[PDB]
Amino acid sequence: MRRIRRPKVRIEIVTYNGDEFGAKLLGFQTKNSMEDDSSVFQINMAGDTYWDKLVMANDIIRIFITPNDDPNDKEGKQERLIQVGMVSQVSKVGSYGNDQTQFRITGQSFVKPFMKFGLGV
Amino acid sequence: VMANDIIRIFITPNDDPNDKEGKQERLIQVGMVSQVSKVGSYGNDQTQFRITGQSFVKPFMKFGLGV
Amino acid sequence: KTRKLTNILSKLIDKTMAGTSKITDFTPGSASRSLLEAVSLEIEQFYILTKENIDWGIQEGIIEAFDFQKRQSKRAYGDVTIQFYQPLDMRMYIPAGTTFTSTRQEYPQQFETLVDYYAEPDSTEIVVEVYCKETGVAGNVPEGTINTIASGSSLIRSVNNEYSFNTGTKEESQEDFKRRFHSFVESRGRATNKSVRYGALQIPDVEG
Amino acid sequence: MKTRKLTNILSKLIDKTMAGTSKITDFTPGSASRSLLEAVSLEIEQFYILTKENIDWGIQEGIIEAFDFQ
Amino acid sequence: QIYESIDLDELNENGIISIEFVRNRTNTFFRIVDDVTTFNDKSDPVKAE
Amino acid sequence: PQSDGISNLHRIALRFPKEGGGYDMYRFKVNPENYTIDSPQRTTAIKTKSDIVIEDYGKDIEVINFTGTTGFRPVREADGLKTGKQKMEELQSRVSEYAMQGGSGNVSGSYLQFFNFTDDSYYKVHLAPQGLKITRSKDEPLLFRYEITLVVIGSLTEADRSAVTTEEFGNVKPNASQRVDEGIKELDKNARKTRDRNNQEISRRENTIYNPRQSTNGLKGNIDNMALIIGYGDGGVS
Amino acid sequence: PQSDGISNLHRIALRFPKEGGGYDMYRFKVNPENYTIDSPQRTTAIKTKSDIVIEDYGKDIEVINFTGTTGFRPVREADGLKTGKQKMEELQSRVSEYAMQGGSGNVSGSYLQFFNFTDDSYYKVHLAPQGLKITRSKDEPLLFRYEITLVVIGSLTEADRSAVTTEEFGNVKPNASQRVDEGIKELDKNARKTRDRNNQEISRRENTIYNPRQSTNGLKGNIDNMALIIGYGDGGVS
Amino acid sequence: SWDEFEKLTEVSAFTNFDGSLKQLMDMVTARPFNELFFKNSEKTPGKAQLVLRKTPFNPTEWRALDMIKVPTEDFIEEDVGKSDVETYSIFTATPAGMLKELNGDVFSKPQFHPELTDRYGYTKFEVENIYL
Amino acid sequence: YHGNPNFYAGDIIVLGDPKYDLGKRLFIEDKQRGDTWEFYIESVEHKFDYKQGYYTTVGVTRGLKDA
Amino acid sequence: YHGNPNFYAGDIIVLGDPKYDLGKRLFIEDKQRGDTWEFYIESVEHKFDYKQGYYTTVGVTRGLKDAILEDGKGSPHRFAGLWNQSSDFMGGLMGEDTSKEL
Amino acid sequence: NFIPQPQGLLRFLNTSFVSKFYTPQLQLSELAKKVLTNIKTDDIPVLEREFNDNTIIHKANDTLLKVQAPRMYMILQSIVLEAYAIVNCFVENPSSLKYLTEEDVSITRENLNYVADYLGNYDDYNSVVLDLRDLDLCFSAIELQLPLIKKEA
Amino acid sequence: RFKKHVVQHEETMQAIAQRYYGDVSYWIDLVEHNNLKYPYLVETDEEKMKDPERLASTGDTLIIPIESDLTDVSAKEINSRDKDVLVELALGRDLNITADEKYFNEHGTSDNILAFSTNGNGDLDTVKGIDNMKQQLQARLLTPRGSLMLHPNYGSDLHNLFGLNIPEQATLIEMEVLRTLTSDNRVKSANLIDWKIQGNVYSGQFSVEIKS
Amino acid sequence: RFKKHVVQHEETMQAIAQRYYGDVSYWIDLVEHNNLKYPYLVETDEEKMKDPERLASTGDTLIIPIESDLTDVSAKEINSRDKDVLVELALGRDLNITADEKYFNEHGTSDNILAFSTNGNGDLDTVKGIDNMKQQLQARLLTPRGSLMLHPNYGSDLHNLFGLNIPEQATLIEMEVLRTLTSDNRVKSANLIDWKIQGNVYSGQFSVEIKS
């Protein structure tokens, strides 16, 4: 038999409600790697709302991914958190030639405070 | 294929019986392998194995005169 | 202190395997694993019963020996008398949950019965207990306030509670209990400045 | 509420079990019924012991709570 | 109730209906065993069931 | 069954999952006009200088596609008198209940059972990416045509992945490790530090289905409890 | 209803938005010749080296497409006598006006409303990127033809997503935050500097929907409101 | 970390001129002998955790890592193979770089295999450790 | 670090699941020929998009067989 | 350079025209929601080809909203309340003062 | 670990007409008793500046209620002690929140309403009432929320 | 939020937890949510007489949390108060303004209709739970959309829709009713059961999925 | 796991390993599994009478591991001495509860139907081998899907499938039975070979492929 999968992503934000932010999700990336000294993630957002005026920098975004079906009682029903970090950039994006626009947000997993805090002299 | 083996490649340019000047079995490159890796995108339903090496630069480059 | 489902079940399977070589299957649906699971689950129930009972002893038992009782929230209750138009001819049936309401506009209280009661054919007047639908002092009511029954059986003439309900005790946290107990225990000190000062307060005219 | 050692439990259990029939009385170590009943009596023994220990711990905790002598 | 599995042969075989106790998952724990009628002869299904 | 030698064929039926427990089904009054089943293979062939290399990686998704209409006559039903229009509306509503709240909310069923009484074949199916397609045309003023594509999860005779029971001979839970962790929890800080040091000391000088019957997998687990309770060192070893 | 011998045919109607709010009611006087409805699914299939994996994300944006011809002979209107050419031109002008005014990303009012009366179903729809294609070939010289394609936003039974009135029990606009902020605005720069110092000291000492009833989320608001009516240090805390 | 082998340390705040705490965190880490990274807290879901532990290449520490299973049935594509990009013969762990061979106590103490150095002769691998 | 050669290291695109995390030991069982592989995770790169499925990269190093 | 955060910077592909030049101040009026933007040009990249139109990139930095057109006033929020208010830098802010609490 | 206290507040805290709706009882809470002893005996740190010109600074000492109505001035002190006690535990050292109960805040509000009503007669000193009415609703939110906090923590 | 349950004959306590959560082990949390003593369920109803509030029997009602609020101590506390009244926390309490349904139903869309009233004596009539929900749909739908003096887009367009009695217009009335009723989160959805066009009387009846 | 085999007339031990495992080289480890003395296979039974347990002769069974367990020393030790007890251990051992075989086939999908029994003397009856597998399939089929107190989603909806005996109900019953039988991983496949109707009586039979 072939497995069936029904993904259901949640997003929670702490300083606009997080549940409304999670609704306009479209895609994200989470580059995490021990080889380099920095973990970074990106989120793609829909253009329904003007996010530039809302999401202030340095906010914390939590992402939760549902692996498989709830009622089936699979081991995947755990709502395991995938990544958490501090946003550090938000930008409008859009190729009006193709008649489509998106908003992109990217951040790093708590490496921003230390990396920015420079012990000056 | 264990590492550090020597592979010789020979290319036939044109037809044997024609008696062309290209019938020479000229060697194109010889070198020492230094990496072998499985490769395959099962989405496209195809896999391959890739081997790469250098033309006798491996012994010298690796041999470090330490202190 | 207390064991769990798995901690008991696994040990039981281990001992079963160790004692005898005649059993090696422990799949779902095996009568042995079933029996073992029911045993484990029963034992977990006893363990939680012991935990709750020890919790209650910690909360109340150690201090109750000094005659100090804790107030526990309970449903208001008391005796209610029902009168019939005429003497019954057949045994009448009154189910539990038979519901009661007050026609007085100042008393929206309601009561109900917990257990089934029956009226014998020879009887003519029956007393049945009722329990309020709400906890605390809300259930309390003065005498003669129900005046009605919800089951609409035309044999019943009138209904009324002979005595006021006063058993709807309020909920008091153990902090006040502990405070009062400690105050009682500190007041028994002798030959101390603070105790002497406290003892001078008993006279009404001694203030400063 | 008192201890009852494993063998006391196990004996009471088999003694009750044999009432009404005589197609069970074979309790060598190899028997599986003996193993099951040994395991049940082991668990009941552990239950009694943990109960007694938890009672002692409850007594101690109430003594803590009553007079606030942490 | 009195009646249980062996009685739920006796009564049903004599054409009396009764409700059976099934310990779990079936909605109310209770299902009704048959639709036999009070007629004596059970051989004919039109009369019997 | 078909119409040949045997008694009258049975139409094709679809079984959907009831929200409130149990199941609801849908039988077509009119057999489909076209019925296609694609069963490709995931295999690639690449020739070398003087040989042919064939590689395969299993059976591909068996795609089921069929097209049907609904009759204009009414016909008896299990409850009520439903004409072709009502039948197609109910089909639409069922597909929309299976599809619209599939990715959102929750659906009790994990799959759909597709019964081919006429072809004597059964499969477990899920809505294809092409999905349902309804169309009504000039030269069919009263009728309604439907076009659906499906992907086969697998044979209906086999059991569900999540409802499979392994062999599971002997104890599955290693209780030795469980009590070792429980006993280690109560240990003092010094005991744990000494157990780490002992572990390091053993480690740096090395090179130089639980069942105790008919197996040796649960060996060190029993030692760990015995070494903790008895006391090999202040904490223990391993 | 369709013509079924029980009720007379009922033809389609479009309810466009009006500039000053409210709506038009464009009803077709001849029904479409072709009518197609697509229901695509977001299901995807990926093939792993040893198994197939089926993954679904739920219903995708539906497409509505239909084609027809406006009648020739004059036909009375609910407020006029309009011919087929006037009807087609009115349609073109409605669609032009709807399309052109959408130059701010999206109209803040309604989308189109599509009363598909013939078979009982109702949708909220938007102009597809095919648009209103109008043609008139040599064949049928005096009959116009129109081709419309539409994308479905949602059922018309359901009100707008963002417009739904939430529970909003308790108080979403607490006064504690407001009067705290007013207090802190009213404080002297040295006062706020000392408050910052006290906050930093507390942070050093860390280690080494709202309802006044049956809720703890608003606990801090009641405490933050204090330490200003009472001089808990030269300035509030937290 | 390796408490037994590491002595007492006097690590300075300003070891790096106007650098970040990450730059100063690297010195304390003393890589590759200790592994530092940011990862989710499985033991306490909902919050992150900073990890600083000795490297898992030790035998007992390797066994202390939690295992995870995955069959081929979840594999979309793979690209895995040997490589001779990293190759060293002599390994040593010098102490903090103030101590120097011509003005004090024993400078270093390396290790090598006799068979290994035939293919790759005298290939050294040096790491300074602030701790020692 | 003497055993750098003869170890396996690369990048693997397993199916998108949250079980995999940085620093975690990875066990793989090959059904192609009944082989067993062991790895050490050093990097993971997630990718979620409705346009095409949901993938998760698992970078590995220091890999060996017969696990 | 204190106000690097909260400024806008990127690359814009306006229509291909020679009016735009390096170092020139760029004013944009958003018709989407009646907003106004101000920018500073730091880079331009032209692209001319008969195969597909004619484009001109306009790199911008140090961008801010709520711009004004009159006399090149620009955005009044550019000179924020933190522009000039400041003070001399010395220790005693973190860790230096904790030992001196005599 | 205690933030130093202002000199004003520290001096303030260290020591017929009747309303028909709410009346006082001059009852002190256990938590308020313990704090009072702490300040009486131990020498808590204190600040030197007095920048914050709010609360009792030139409002509670400026008014003539101190000399005219000293009994009323004893209510105000009790409310400050009860207001300062609840703010003490939550900000720092939460171990003292075990002694607080519902009735402790109930009586405080009643005392607040009585002194507040009496101050309404005076037309000059309405500034004090301005803060007391805001503080009055602050105690009620603790009153309807304090039993849930202890069980949660 | 929660679900109701009714206790059945000799019902095993663990069977409840399994039957609604799949694992057995959450019965410790469920019985804490329902303030039960160790005798969680009992066959005999006379045993309940001794400790009615802390002892349940056959046919009694229990409260089942949803999975997310299972281990929340505060939900356990609140769920120990609102026993078989928990509905009141979701639907709410509000003041009664429907003084006579015999009055406003005969006057319809207009100014100067509804009013506060008093049930019993002295205490102003507060209308609660399902009866609050009745009012909060009725009073909403009778208001015209523009009306209310804060948060506009209240109400409905119903007063516009007294056009010609022909079928399309009847479906438009259905649509505005559906739109108005699904506009409040307390209802999941709505749909039409039936409609009946008399010579000048519209009659139609609609279902709504109130929550809980 | 293992495959069964028998000694043929003048077959050499070399020949077996070569035919099943490919390489002849493996016979050397293969004799230790069958615990054989040097005359590993010998034609004559009066020669097996020399020391019967340590030899095999013409007509005797042999054990043939799978190649993965060929090299395992534990598999060698176990297969050496257990011999015929392999099948029983490999199919596992369990308490026998088919006491009333005539009876449980009169009231299926009703509870209280099975019961312990006694065989031998003074010990509860036990079942092993293929009988155990049958008994377990039987019990699994006659149990409703959510009625065991742990690990639910075990059993069948056979108690729910009673219907009008039209063929669709019969295919449904077939599919449920096949799902129920294929739930256990030990069984490979099931398939129907007959379904048959007698008015209000269903009848049919299923073939199940049990691993060797």
SS3 C159: strand
Residue M186 CA to chain centroid, in angstroms? 8
DSSP assignments along B29-53, one per residue: EEEEEEEEEEEEETTTTEEEEEEEE
CA distances from K40 to A76, F193, K35, K74 (A): 60, 47, 9, 17
Structural tokens at position K70: 């000293």
Question: Could you say which DSSP state residue K63 is in?
Answer: S
CA distances from L77 to G171, J18, K152, L3 (A): 22, 72, 9, 17
Q: Does I5 touch chain A (CB under 8 A)?
A: no
Question: Is the distance from CB of L64 to CB of L3 less than 8 angstroms?
Answer: yes
Nearest to H55 by CA among H78, H29, H79, H73: H29
Q: Does I10 touch chain B (CB under 8 A)?
A: yes
SS3 C165: strand
What is the C-alpha to C-alpha distance for residues C144 and C83, in angstroms, rounded to an integer?
Answer: 13
Structural tokens at position L102: 């015999």
What is the C-alpha to C-alpha distance for residues H51 and J63, in angstroms, rounded to an integer?
Answer: 40
What is the C-alpha to C-alpha distance for residues A85 and F206, in angstroms, rounded to an integer?
Answer: 42
SS3 M133: helix
Question: Is the distance from CB of M177 to CB of M189 less than 8 angstroms?
Answer: no
What is the C-alpha to C-alpha distance for residues K43 and J41, in angstroms, rounded to an integer?
Answer: 64
CA distances from C34 to C9, J23, M149 (A): 10, 83, 8
**Residues with Cβ within 8 Å of residue A74, at least 6 apart in sequence:** A67, A68, F162
What is the C-alpha to C-alpha distance for residues B43 and H75, in angstroms, rounded to an integer?
Answer: 10
Q: Which helix (H) or strand (E) holds H27?
A: helix H21-29
What is the C-alpha to C-alpha distance for residues D4 and D48, in angstroms, rounded to an integer?
Answer: 7
Question: Is the distance from CB of L155 to CB of L146 less than 8 angstroms?
Answer: yes
What subunits touch chain A, counting only 3 or more CB pairs under 8 A? F, G, H, I, J
Side-chain half-sphere of G116: how many Cα atoms within 13 Å? 19
- What are phi and psi for residue G194, nearest 5 degrees? -65, -35
Is D57 in contact with C1 (Cβ distance < 8 A)? yes
What is the C-alpha to C-alpha distance for residues F203 and J58, in angstroms, rounded to an integer?
Answer: 63
- Residues β-bridged to residue M42: M57
Q: What experiment produced this structure?
A: cryo-EM
Burial F204-228, CB ≥16 within 10 A → b, else e: eeeeeebbeebeeebeebbbbbebb
Q: Does H74 touch chain G (CB under 8 A)?
A: yes
In sign, the C-alpha dihedral spanning J51, J53, J59, J65 is negative
Number of CB atoms found within 10 A of residue G198's CB: 21
Peptide linkage before H32 cis (omega within 30 of 0):
yes
Burial C146-166, CB ≥16 within 10 A → b, else e: beebeeeeeebeebebeeebe
Residue F143 CA to chain centroid, in angstroms? 37
Structural tokens at position D51: 């109960």
Q: Which amino acid is at C56?
A: W
Q: Does A118 touch chain H (CB under 8 A)?
A: yes
What is the C-alpha to C-alpha distance for residues A79 and A67, in angstroms, rounded to an integer?
Answer: 8
The three-state DSSP-derived secondary structure of C39-107 is HHHHHHHHHHHHHHHHHHHHHHHHHHCCCCCCCCCCCCEEEEEEEECCCCCCCEEECCCCEEECCCCCC
Header resolution in angstroms = 4.5
Nearest to L171 by CA among F97, G1, G154: G1
DSSP assignments along chain L, one per residue: -EEEEE--TT--HHHHHHHHHSSSTTHHHHHHHTT--S--EES-STTTTTSSTT-EETT-EEEEE-GGGSS-HHHHHHHHHSTTTTHHHHH-EEE---S-TTTGGGT-S-SS-------SSSS--EEETHHHHHHHHHHHHTSBTT-SSSSSS-SBSGGG----SSHHHHHHHHHHHHHHHTTBTTEEEEEEEEEEE-SS-EEEEEEEEE--
Q: What is the CA radius of gyration of chain J?
A: 21
What is the C-alpha to C-alpha distance for residues E12 and F80, in angstroms, rounded to an integer?
Answer: 34
Strands F121-127, F145-155: pairing kind: antiparallel
- What are phi and psi for residue C168, nearest 5 degrees? -80, 70
Q: Which helix (H) or strand (E) holds M101?
A: helix M101-104
From A6, A8, A74, residue closest to F162, measured CB to CB: A74
What is the C-alpha to C-alpha distance for residues C108 and C123, in angstroms, rounded to an integer?
Answer: 31
Question: Could you say which DSSP state residue C162 is in?
Answer: S
**Residues with Cβ within 8 Å of residue M173, at least 6 apart in sequence:** M158, M161, M202
55-74 in chain M: CB under 8 A from chain F: 74
* Sheet containing strand J35-48, strands side by side: J8-15, J54-65, J35-48, J25-30
Q: What is the CA radius of gyration of chain E?
A: 12
Distance from CA of F164 to the nearest CA of M (A): 5
In sign, the C-alpha dihedral spanning A48, A51, A54, A58 is positive
In sign, the C-alpha dihedral spanning L106, L108, L111, L112 is positive
Number of CB atoms found within 10 A of residue A118's CB: 16
What is the C-alpha to C-alpha distance for residues F162 and F167, in angstroms, rounded to an integer?
Answer: 15
Question: Is the distance from CB of G18 to CB of G29 less than 8 angstroms?
Answer: no
Contact residues on chain L for K151, CB-CB shorter than 8 A:
73-74, 77
What is the C-alpha to C-alpha distance for residues L109 and L89, in angstroms, rounded to an integer?
Answer: 31
Contact residues on chain B for I6, CB-CB shorter than 8 A:
3
DSSP assignments along chain F, one per residue: --SSSSS-----EEEEE-TTSSEEEEE-SS--SEEEEE--EEEEEEE-SS-EEEEEEEEPP-EEEEEEE--SS-EE-SSSEE-HHHHHHHHHHHHHHHHTTTSSS--S-SSEEEEETTTTEEEEEEE-SS--EEEEETT-TT--EEEEEEEEEEESSSPPGGG-B---BSBSS-HHHHHHHHHHHT--HHHHHHHHHHHHHHHTT----B-STT--TTHHHHHHHHHHHHTSSSS---
Q: Does K53 touch chain G (CB under 8 A)?
A: yes
Do chains H and B touch by CB distance (3+ pairs < 8 Å)? yes
The dihedral formed by the CA atoms of I56, I60, I63 and I65, expressed in degrees to the nearest 10 = 0
Strands J35-48, J25-30: pairing kind: antiparallel
Distance from CA of D29 to the nearest CA of M (A): 12
Question: Could you say which DSSP state residue I52 is in?
Answer: S
Burial M110-143, CB ≥16 within 10 A → b, else e: bbebbeebeeeeebbebbbeeebbebbbbbbbbb
CA distances from M83 to A39, M34, M60, M65, M75 (A): 59, 8, 12, 12, 12
- What are phi and psi for residue G15, nearest 5 degrees? -115, 90
Question: Is the distance from CB of H66 to CB of I41 less than 8 angstroms?
Answer: no
Question: Could you say which DSSP state residue E17 is in?
Answer: -
Number of CB atoms found within 10 A of residue E17's CB: 13
Structural tokens at position M137: 């399939």
What is the C-alpha to C-alpha distance for residues F145 and F68, in angstroms, rounded to an integer?
Answer: 6
Question: Could you say which DSSP state residue M144 is in?
Answer: B
45-74 in chain H: CB under 8 A from chain A: 45-48, 50
SS3 M183: coil
What is the C-alpha to C-alpha distance for residues M201 and G97, in angstroms, rounded to an integer?
Answer: 70
Structural tokens at position I51: 């346009």
Question: Is the distance from CB of H30 to CB of I11 less than 8 angstroms?
Answer: no
* Closest residue, chain F, to A70 (C-alpha): F106
Side-chain half-sphere of G226: how many Cα atoms within 13 Å? 26
Structural tokens at position J64: 């801010």
F interface test, pick of C13, C15, C22, C32 with most F CB neighbours within 10 Å = C13
Cα G73–Cα G74–Cα G78 angle in degrees, nearest 5 = 140
Counting beta carbons within 10 angstroms of the beta carbon of residue H105, is it exposed (0 to 12), middle (13 to 18) or buried (19 or more)? exposed
What is the C-alpha to C-alpha distance for residues H93 and I37, in angstroms, rounded to an integer?
Answer: 32
Is L22 in contact with M152 (Cβ distance < 8 A)? yes
Q: Does M152 touch chain L (CB under 8 A)?
A: yes
Question: Is the distance from CB of B66 to CB of H123 less than 8 angstroms?
Answer: yes
Q: Which amino acid is at A56?
A: M
**Residues with Cβ within 8 Å of residue M96, at least 6 apart in sequence:** M116, M117, M119, M124, M125, M126, M127, M135
Distance from CA of M145 to the nearest CA of E (A): 8
Q: Does F211 touch chain C (CB under 8 A)?
A: yes
Write down the residue that tokens 């026609």 correspond to: C103
Nearest to I55 by CA among I19, I14, I22: I14
The three-state DSSP-derived secondary structure of chain J is CCCCCCCEEEEEEEECCCCCCCCCEEEEEECCCCEEEEEEEEEEEEEECCCCCEEEEEEEEEEEECCCCHHHCCCHHHCCCCCCCCCCCCCCCCCCCCCCCC
What is the C-alpha to C-alpha distance for residues G153 and G107, in angstroms, rounded to an integer?
Answer: 14
Do chains G and D touch by CB distance (3+ pairs < 8 Å)? no
Question: Is the distance from CB of F70 to CB of F29 less than 8 angstroms?
Answer: yes
Q: Which amino acid is at C173?
A: S
Question: Is the distance from CB of C146 to CB of C159 less than 8 angstroms?
Answer: yes
Question: Is the distance from CB of L21 to CB of L29 less than 8 angstroms?
Answer: no
Is G46 in contact with B45 (Cβ distance < 8 A)? no
Burial L6-17, CB ≥16 within 10 A → b, else e: ebbeebbbbbbb
Structural tokens at position K6: 């202002």
Number of CB atoms found within 10 A of residue B30's CB: 13
F interface test, pick of C5, C20, C26 with most F CB neighbours within 10 Å = C26
Question: Is the distance from CB of K37 to CB of K13 less than 8 angstroms?
Answer: no
Nearest to G232 by CA among K100, K37, K91: K91
Contact residues on chain L for M152, CB-CB shorter than 8 A:
18, 22
Contact residues on chain M for D32, CB-CB shorter than 8 A:
95, 123-124, 126
What is the C-alpha to C-alpha distance for residues K47 and K50, in angstroms, rounded to an integer?
Answer: 8
Contact residues on chain G for K148, CB-CB shorter than 8 A:
214-216
What is the C-alpha to C-alpha distance for residues G156 and G143, in angstroms, rounded to an integer?
Answer: 33
What is the C-alpha to C-alpha distance for residues G229 and K55, in angstroms, rounded to an integer?
Answer: 5
Contact residues on chain B for F42, CB-CB shorter than 8 A:
45
Q: What is the CA radius of gyration of chain A?
A: 17
Q: Does A2 touch chain H (CB under 8 A)?
A: no
SS3 D5: coil
Strands L202-210, L187-197: pairing kind: antiparallel
H interface test, pick of G47, G49, G54 with most H CB neighbours within 10 Å = G49
Q: Does B38 touch chain H (CB under 8 A)?
A: yes
What is the C-alpha to C-alpha distance for residues M149 and M151, in angstroms, rounded to an integer?
Answer: 7
DSSP assignments along M13-78, one per residue: HHHHHHHHHS-GGGHHHHHHHTT--SS-EES-HHHHTTSGGG-EETT-EEEEE-HHHHS-HHHHHH
- What are phi and psi for residue M22, nearest 5 degrees? 85, -75
Is J10 in contact with A57 (Cβ distance < 8 A)? no
Side-chain half-sphere of K54: how many Cα atoms within 13 Å? 23
What is the C-alpha to C-alpha distance for residues B45 and B34, in angstroms, rounded to an integer?
Answer: 27
Is C106 in contact with L52 (Cβ distance < 8 A)? no
Question: Is the distance from CB of K129 to CB of K116 less than 8 angstroms?
Answer: yes
Residue C95 CA to chain centroid, in angstroms? 22
What is the C-alpha to C-alpha distance for residues L194 and G236, in angstroms, rounded to an integer?
Answer: 63
The three-state DSSP-derived secondary structure of chain G is CCCCCCCCCCCCEEECECCCCCECCEECCCCCCEEEEECCECCEEEECCCCEEEECCCECCCEEEEEEECCCCCEEECCEEECHHHHHHHHHHHHHHHHHHCCCCCCCCCCEEEEECCCCEEEEEEECCCCCEEECCCCCCCCCEEEEEEEEEEECCCCCCCCCECCCCCCCCCHHHHHHHHHHHHCCHHHHHHHHHHHHHHHHCCCCCCCCCCCCCCHHHHHHHCCCCCCCCCCCCC
Q: Does F102 touch chain A (CB under 8 A)?
A: yes
165-204 in chain F: CB under 8 A from chain H: 197, 199-200, 202-204
Nearest to D37 by CA among D25, D52, D49: D25
**Residues with Cβ within 8 Å of residue E25, at least 6 apart in sequence:** L19, M144, M145, M146, M147
The dihedral formed by the CA atoms of J70, J76, J79 and J85, expressed in degrees to the nearest 10 = 130
Structural tokens at position G189: 């720069």
* Closest residue, chain B, to G49 (C-alpha): B42
Distance between first and last Cα of chain I: 20
Question: Could you say which DSSP state residue I12 is in?
Answer: E
Question: Is the distance from CB of M174 to CB of M186 less than 8 angstroms?
Answer: no
What is the C-alpha to C-alpha distance for residues M63 and M70, in angstroms, rounded to an integer?
Answer: 11
Structural tokens at position C178: 């502990």
- What are phi and psi for residue D49, nearest 5 degrees? -65, -50
Question: Is the distance from CB of F58 to CB of G49 less than 8 angstroms?
Answer: no
